[PDB]
């Protein structure tokens, strides 16, 4: 700790005075993952392997829930041409469990693929399909020079809008009978919403036994963090999933697969200081632990 | 077997078209340099801006 004072003050000499050095943090013991009791695999083949996409004029959205389906098959095997993710990343997708997943499905030409982006202008974005400005998800414009191509027609509107109708006339009924620059492709969009409801679709990470009353790093549906898990007299409402405090700190989370009341108290942290008498006189050092019961060192 | 041969065959797509990547890893000026630009060296000047 004398050497700590020599380290912090950036000098080989120290004098009379307590010097703040660092913070005494108790390291986590072993990682714990508690995903819900669900173990089925969701049919992502009923969106990606589904190749009869729905034209952007009236596209199809698939709702999926209640599983721990893996993203590894889509992440590793890059059987696509464009993998642009806003929010999540292709590698970290396996760590988080999501409240709900909607897989938008439509087609668009080889050009104007950049119009599938938050705010990016263009006729397709102006009338057909407009992603919200605060979009969060992955866009996969996987190659369809042989699947897309007639029936796949195409033509301001709200984010995630949907309105199919027909009215010197004027009608937007346009098709495309293709058979590479002008060639249409297949575009699938995954729209995630996080931390809004009980997470239902999780990752492949195997569940791990829960631990209590110990500083342990945890992962509850994706709530990555480190802390000690204790019991509290507070009762979660049956509709409720997980609590929070000011500064968006999730102090209380009802642990899934057990539905038990828990409080994420932060691990034992205490301001470690030094009471040194100065290298001129002595070298014996005294250490302070700011506001910790002696029991915890 | 931990290793395979793709082959990078000739008349195929960009996936099978080999791009012979050469990676030039440089380093900041922190040591004597044995490689230098083709700049024409001149003399030095002392006690002058």
């Amino acid at each position, epitope marked *: 700790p004398l050497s700590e004072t020599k380290c912090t003050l950036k000098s080989f000499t120290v004098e009379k005075g307590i010097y703040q050095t660092s913070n005494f943090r108790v390291q986590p013991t072993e990682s714990i993952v508690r995903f819900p009791n669900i173990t089925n695999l969701c*049919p992502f*083949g009923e*969106v990606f392997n589904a*190749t009869r*996409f729905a034209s952007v004029y009236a596209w199809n959205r698939k709702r999926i829930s209640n599983c721990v389906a893996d993203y590894s098959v889509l992440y590793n095997s890059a059987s696509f041409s464009t993998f642009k993710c806003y929010g999540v990343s292709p590698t970290k997708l396996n760590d988080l469990c999501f409240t709900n997943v909607y897989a938008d499905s439509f087609v668009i030409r080889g050009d104007e693929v950049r119009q599938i982006a938050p705010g990016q202008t263009g006729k397709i974005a102006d009338y057909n399909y407009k992603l919200p400005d605060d979009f969060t998800g992955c866009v996969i414009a996987w190659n369809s020079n042989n*699947l897309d191509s007639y029936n796949y027609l195409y033509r301001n509107l709200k984010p995630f809008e949907r309105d199919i109708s027909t009215e010197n006339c004027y009608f937007p009924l346009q098709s495309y009978g293709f*058979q590479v620059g002008y060639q249409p492709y297949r575009v699938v969009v995954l729209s995630f919403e996080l931390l809004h409801a009980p997470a239902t679709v999780c990752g492949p990470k195997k569940s791990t036994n829960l631990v209590k009353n110990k500083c342990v790093n945890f992962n509850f549906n994706g709530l990555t963090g480190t802390g000690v898990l204790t019991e509290s007299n507070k009762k979660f409402l049956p509709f409720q999933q997980f609590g929070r405090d000011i500064a968006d700190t999730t102090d209380a989370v009802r642990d899934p697969q057990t539905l038990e009341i828990l409080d994420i108290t932060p691990c034992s942290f205490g301001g470690v200081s030094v009471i040194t008498p100065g290298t001129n006189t002595s070298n014996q050092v005294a250490v302070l632990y700011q506001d910790v019961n002696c029991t915890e060192v | 077997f931990p290793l395979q041969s793709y082959g990078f065959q000739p*008349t195929n797509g960009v996936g099978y078209q080999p791009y012979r990547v050469v990676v030039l890893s440089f380093e900041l000026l922190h040591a004597p340099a044995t490689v230098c630009g083709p700049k024409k060296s001149t003399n030095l000047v002392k006690n002058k801006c």
Partner: antibody
Amino acid sequence: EVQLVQSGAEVKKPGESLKISCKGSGYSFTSYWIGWVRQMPGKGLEWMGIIYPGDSDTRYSPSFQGQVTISADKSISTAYLQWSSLKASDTAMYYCARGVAVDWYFDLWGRGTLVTVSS
Amino acid sequence: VLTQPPSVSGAPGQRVTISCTGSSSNIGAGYDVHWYQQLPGTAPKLLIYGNSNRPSGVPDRFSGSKSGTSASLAITGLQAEDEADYYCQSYDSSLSALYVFGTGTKVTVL
């Protein structure tokens, strides 16, 4: 002829590795799908796999994936069908036929090969 | 996986129909249903594509249609040459398989 042709009568023995070839000629193979079809004698036919010689994109049937290997030799317009361990119960009629997209059907068929493998 | 009437027998000069029955996810999903003629011992030939389009050179006696969960082949005026195997088609997205094949139909004329 405008067809997906193969070799003549084939008689072999189990345990040997055989890669039969299907040749494409007489059309613009770049814009169309080209694939194969299996058909057991006296039982319903099953498309095994299909490839797109435009960019050589490979697709197989769930029942017939991995057991066989194909390749679209688009430089010579050839479709392969690779067997590593031919089975005695593999006797059937194999059709290499090229299909279409959007509508997703077959419009032209090959004559097929009488593949009979027995001990 | 796409059930068909296994065998059809009929006199020459008869109007017969083949039921391309499926499920709500393969045939009744609204996707296109296509058809062929599989002459016994020879290569199959296309009969109906798109449920309304007709190939070049086909006789008009054969026509195709779809009715909800099942599809129907219109055979008008059977003749003695029509002794052949007939099989279904459709397209399935979610099933991964770009083509799906029917069980099969025998159509025989004496």
